[PDB]
Amino acid sequence: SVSATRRISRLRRHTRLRKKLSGTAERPRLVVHRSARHIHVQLVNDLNGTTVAAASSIEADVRGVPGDKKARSVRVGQLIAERAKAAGIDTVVFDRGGYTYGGRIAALADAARENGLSF
Amino acid sequence: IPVGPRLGNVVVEVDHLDKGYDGRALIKDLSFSLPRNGIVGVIGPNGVGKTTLFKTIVGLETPDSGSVKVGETVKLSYVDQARAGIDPRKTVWEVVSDGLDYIQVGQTEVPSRAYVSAFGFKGP
Amino acid sequence: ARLVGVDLPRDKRMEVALTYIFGIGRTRSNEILAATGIDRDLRTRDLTEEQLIHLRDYIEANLKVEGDLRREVQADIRRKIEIGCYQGLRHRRGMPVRGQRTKTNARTRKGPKRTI
Amino acid sequence: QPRLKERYRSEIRDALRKQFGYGNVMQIPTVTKVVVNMGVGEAARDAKLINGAVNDLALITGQKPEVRRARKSIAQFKLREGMPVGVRVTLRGDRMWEFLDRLTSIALPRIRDFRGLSPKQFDGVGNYTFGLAEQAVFHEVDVDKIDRVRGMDINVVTSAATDDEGRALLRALGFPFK
Amino acid sequence: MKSDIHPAYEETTVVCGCGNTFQTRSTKPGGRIVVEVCSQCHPFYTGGRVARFEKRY
RNA sequence: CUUCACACAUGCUACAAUGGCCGGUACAAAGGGCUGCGAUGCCGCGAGGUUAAGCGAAUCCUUAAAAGCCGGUCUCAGUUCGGAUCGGGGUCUGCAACUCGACCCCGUGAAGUCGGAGUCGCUAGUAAUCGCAGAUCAGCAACGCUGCGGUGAAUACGUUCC
RNA sequence: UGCCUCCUAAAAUGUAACGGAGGCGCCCAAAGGUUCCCUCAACCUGGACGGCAAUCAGGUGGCGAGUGUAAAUGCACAAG
Numbered sequence A: 001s002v003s004a005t006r007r008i009s010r011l012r013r014h015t016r017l018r019k020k021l022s023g024t025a026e027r028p029r030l031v032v033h034r035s036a037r038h039i040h041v042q043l044v045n046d047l048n049g050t051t052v053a054a055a056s057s058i059e060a061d062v063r064g065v066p067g068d069k070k071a072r073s074v075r076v077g078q079l080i081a082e083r084a085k086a087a088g089i090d091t092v093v094f095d096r097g098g099y100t101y102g103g104r105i106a107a108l109a110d111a112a113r114e115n116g117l118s119f
Numbered sequence B: 001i002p003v004g005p006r007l008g009n010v011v012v013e014v015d016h017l018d019k020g021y022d023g024r025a026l027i028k029d030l031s032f033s034l035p036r037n038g039i040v041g042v043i044g045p046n047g048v049g050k051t052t053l054f055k056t057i058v059g060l061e062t063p064d065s066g067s068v069k070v071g072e073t074v075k076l077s078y079v080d081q082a083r084a085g086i087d088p089r090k091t092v093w094e095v096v097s098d099g100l101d102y103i104q105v106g107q108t109e110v111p112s113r114a115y116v117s118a119f120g121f122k123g124p
Numbered sequence C: 001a002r003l004v005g006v007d008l009p010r011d012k013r014m015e016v017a018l019t020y021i022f023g024i025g026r027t028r029s030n031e032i033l034a035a036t037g038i039d040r041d042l043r044t045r046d047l048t049e050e051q052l053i054h055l056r057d058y059i060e061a062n063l064k065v066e067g068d069l070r071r072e073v074q075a076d077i078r079r080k081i082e083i084g085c086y087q088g089l090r091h092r093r094g095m096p097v098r099g100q101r102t103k104t105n106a107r108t109r110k111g112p113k114r115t116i
Numbered sequence D: 001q002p003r004l005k006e007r008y009r010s011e012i013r014d015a016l017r018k019q020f021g022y023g024n025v026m027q028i029p030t031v032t033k034v035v036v037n038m039g040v041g042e043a044a045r046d047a048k049l050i051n052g053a054v055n056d057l058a059l060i061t062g063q064k065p066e067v068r069r070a071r072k073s074i075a076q077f078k079l080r081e082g083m084p085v086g087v088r089v090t091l092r093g094d095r096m097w098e099f100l101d102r103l104t105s106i107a108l109p110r111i112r113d114f115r116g117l118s119p120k121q122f123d124g125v126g127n128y129t130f131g132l133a134e135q136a137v138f139h140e141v142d143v144d145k146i147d148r149v150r151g152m153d154i155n156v157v158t159s160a161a162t163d164d165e166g167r168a169l170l171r172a173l174g175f176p177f178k
Numbered sequence E: 001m002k003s004d005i006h007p008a009y010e011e012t013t014v015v016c017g018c019g020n021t022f023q024t025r026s027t028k029p030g031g032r033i034v035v036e037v038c039s040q041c042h043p044f045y046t047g048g049r050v051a052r053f054e055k056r057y
Numbered sequence F: 001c002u003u004c005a006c007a008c009a010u011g012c013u014a015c016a017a018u019g020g021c022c023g024g025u026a027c028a029a030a031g032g033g034c035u036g037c038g039a040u041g042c043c044g045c046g047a048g049g050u051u052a053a054g055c056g057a058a059u060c061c062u063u064a065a066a067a068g069c070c071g072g073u074c075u076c077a078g079u080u081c082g083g084a085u086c087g088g089g090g091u092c093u094g095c096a097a098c099u100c101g102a103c104c105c106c107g108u109g110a111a112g113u114c115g116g117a118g119u120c121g122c123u124a125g126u127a128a129u130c131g132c133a134g135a136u137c138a139g140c141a142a143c144g145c146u147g148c149g150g151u152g153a154a155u156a157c158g159u160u161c162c
Numbered sequence G: 001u002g003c004c005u006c007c008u009a010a011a012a013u014g015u016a017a018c019g020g021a022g023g024c025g026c027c028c029a030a031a032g033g034u035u036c037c038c039u040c041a042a043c044c045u046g047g048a049c050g051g052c053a054a055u056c057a058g059g060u061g062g063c064g065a066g067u068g069u070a071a072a073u074g075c076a077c078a079a080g
Ligand SMILES: Nc1ncnc2c1ncn2[C@@H]1O[C@H](COP(=O)(O)OP(=O)(O)O)[C@@H](O)[C@H]1O
Pocket: B021, B026, B045, B046, B047, B048, B049, B050, B051, B052, B053, B081
């Protein structure tokens, strides 16, 4: 199989970078989840497991943005940047999610550094 | 020197060879044939056309007029004046070999470090 | 030029070049070059693709060449051994079959000298 | 658009729903890769496979191969670890369909005294593997500009679950069996 | 790595002595690969001692 | 009496270009022949099969001598050298060819690239090479032996040495 | 005869004998630093030369492989 290979291989890449990157209450952790159609993102606070802010491409604001999938990654990257600042967050650590930094995720990350977050 | 296979009655035949690079002509109308079981010496001053005579025989040049003819039996071995095969930033072992243990020296397999230590390069 | 799976050697006269096929010698190669009109004194480098079709089918209708000839020679030897005839016992031991002399010769069915 | 690929999804793809009773079109088998390697064991001596075993599989299959190294040392085979002993090329996608056409149409009946391929060479899941003779059959290499002759062996890897499910697939593509 | 290390692989026309011909993509220069036997003009793609005593007598 | 882990001896054919093969064309001597020698004619790729002229033979048959000569091709190769071994299909003689015959046709194409210590023959129509015939004999293991002619050399200072 | 690991050593540490077994007087310019990526051995089935075992392909396999070097403690999250 290849669909069962890809889940096991990316949650092993996700555990490898998780040993050294955890994220706390004053510096939360921006966790991306990249599918073929959308991307989801949330700030997780790994001391009691509590998401403080979240944004996704499946809601109505990101769905009506013209262009490719990188431009919808920029739009969801601007949403969780302006939702982190409504909860008192201005510095986070960036969780790759097991993926490769580049493409849609680096377009999410660079669109969140322009709008306030300082990673 | 390792011995090779059986050598025929026709070793190298040269019939009316002409060779040059420019208006200066080096070899002009030469006819000879290399014998079987002998030592042949090539004599001449510098810059006169002796390494070009080998490089038409080994197949790295092209004659102007006339042909070079070898024969079906001859396996050719060619040491060179310029030492072009040996590269400086590679050790004396792994130029003879290529990281391999055993090499071919003509239908036999001697070990490579046993081969270079037969050429004086012994130990470290 | 491949003819039946034999890959004829270049610069060789067609009288003799066809004899490198396992199954054709000098007399049978004289009738390959008779029923197809190709002359005897022609080199094999000048062999036309229109010519080579004419003698890749006269052989397959009238001759017996590689593969299905060499599997007839080794099968007739195979017939003699398990039926237990005299030549079959004589093939299993490497001694000559056609009533030859085995006292001072037959160094072809046998090897070189063993020298006890 | 290669002709063997379009012939696959025109009548081969539909015929396997009749010979085997599948309930879904995703279950229909499909060849996924064709792996070719020389396996040059006479490279632990003489170190000459770059000129001879790489320049020919590049011409046969289309892309340059990978040199494979030995995993463990064997004293009886005159071999080390990390020594070049094998040369592999993997064919995917549209160059797979062009190689499987060019193998079965014009190549494979150039084997000297050819009589077929055996249909018992499945591994148990549906993956066929045969072997060839030398640097003959493929026209893209020539017999005059080469070193010593050397053969290969060719895997064909399908998505079929069992043996005869892959036998019916390769009979339709054009492998001669007996 | 799928750039200027792989050899030339361009479209190619193959003809046979029988008359069958088709078009694929190969490495032969000029697109002029010419066969003398193909998948339709080859055999296998299209097809005792007692009896010899009677033939003698 | 013909066996075969081996060993010696006498020969034959070779290892090629002073040669191989293909086509054309000259020149012998001595012998043998009625339970035979088969001219000619036809049949067979060939061994041979059949018909039958002539002849106890300076008559008829054996009888095409081969090297040689002229021309063509092969171009130094384990080969268009070499023809061993083996597979198939045949002819002949003979009650009968398995052990164990010769010959023919096709296919197969082994060793061998001039031979270690040693050793052999030959002084002229000789050696070296090429054929042909006879005796025994139904046939034949005829490359042996006894003969026959063709082409045809090189050296002999000398008696120191074996 | 100094150093390093185990057992003796009696479930912290330490503990003698001319008690029981073994290593060291180096090696590596990458076998260091960092960033990313991968899972091994063995067994079974299929495959030109190719054999028990070279390279290929597919199943099975949670540590039995591996660690420059002795042993113990570690290491599959890998320190492989
Ligand atoms: N590639 C080249 N192009 C032009 N001239 C050349 C080249 N190589 C050599 N030559 C000339 O050939 C002449 C003879 O060289 P040669 O005598 O063969 O060298 P060697 O002395 O090594 O034998 C030299 O004078 C040189 O100038």
